[PDB]
């Protein structure tokens, strides 16, 4: 059954986001706009709005360089 499933590897998108501890939800992808030496590069953090430090809801620390 090979050549069905020669195709079928490259229908396989990026793999996902990674997920931010500590919510277990999906990240998101943002871009360093500050020109110098990172410009273009980008990173991970947690997707939630940012809140008051005692709010459990509020974006936590995930950080991650995309490579
Ligand atoms: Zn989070």
Redesign the pocket.
């Known amino acids: 059954n090979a050549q069905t499933a020669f195709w079928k590897s490259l229908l396989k998108g990026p793999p996902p986001p990674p997920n931010?501890k500590?919510?277990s939800?999906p990240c998101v992808l943002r871009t360093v706009k500050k020109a110098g030496p990172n410009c273009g590069r980008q990173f991970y953090v947690?997707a939630?709005p940012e809140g008051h430090s005692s709010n459990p809801q509020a974006?936590?620390n995930?950080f991650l360089w995309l490579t």
Do not use: I, Q, V, W
């Open positions: 931010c500590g919510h939800e947690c939630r974006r936590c995930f």
